[PDB]
Amino acid sequence: FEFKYPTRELAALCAREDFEPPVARLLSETGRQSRTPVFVVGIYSGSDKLGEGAASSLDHARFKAAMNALKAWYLYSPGENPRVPSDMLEEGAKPWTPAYIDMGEVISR
RNA sequence: GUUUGUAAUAAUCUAGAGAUUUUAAGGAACUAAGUACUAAUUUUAUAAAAAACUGAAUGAUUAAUAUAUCUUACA
Ligand SMILES: [Mg+2]
Ligand SMILES: [Mg+2]
């Protein structure tokens, strides 16, 4: 994954799914006014925590938190060893259950 | 200035080694001041690499974008 303006893609995702607008919140911090600080930022849509990222800058920590929120959306997995439609060709197989079909990747500014 | 000490020549005196006068003379490693007389004097000698990170405050300038499609315009 290589993101470009991940903060806009996450705002567009929440808008598409009708989630509350994403708000970045400082969960923890230490070393502000130092050479290697640690800002732990978490992006919430209402009261639910979507993603979190820890970086040495406030902006970077906010971008890293949005990227991790988008990865969690794209890297959703129903299971590690899921059934494949090719399994029905092998006779003697259980009935096929409809799989999850996504709408498509978010297109943002 | 300080220091050393009264040069030579000349005049006079002297058995003659010398004396007197011109003579506070003539010198001088030194000190101070003044003076550009001498030397600081040959056509871009050498070295020196040169503005970090995060937060905060406060400015300037700017596409600081994405998706679909393969034709579009001119002649
Ligand atoms: Mg004297
Ligand atoms: Mg700096």
From Swiss-Prot:
Belongs to the ribonuclease III family. Mitochondrion-specific ribosomal protein mL44 subfamily. The lineage of its organism: Eukaryota, Fungi, Dikarya, Ascomycota, Pezizomycotina. This is Large ribosomal subunit protein mL44. Component of the mitochondrial large ribosomal subunit (mt-LSU). Mature N.crassa 74S mitochondrial ribosomes consist of a small (37S) and a large (54S) subunit. The 37S small subunit contains a 16S ribosomal RNA (16S mt-rRNA) and 32 different proteins. The 54S large subunit contains a 23S rRNA (23S mt-rRNA) and 42 different proteins. mL44 forms a heterodimer with mL57 and stabilizes rRNA expansion segments 1/2 at a membrane-facing protuberance close to the point of attachment of the ribosome to the translocon in the membrane. It is found in: Mitochondrion. It comes from the Eukaryota. Component of the mitochondrial ribosome (mitoribosome), a dedicated translation machinery responsible for the synthesis of mitochondrial genome-encoded proteins, including at least some of the essential transmembrane subunits of the mitochondrial respiratory chain. The mitoribosomes are attached to the mitochondrial inner membrane and translation products are cotranslationally integrated into the membrane. Transmembrane segments: none annotated.
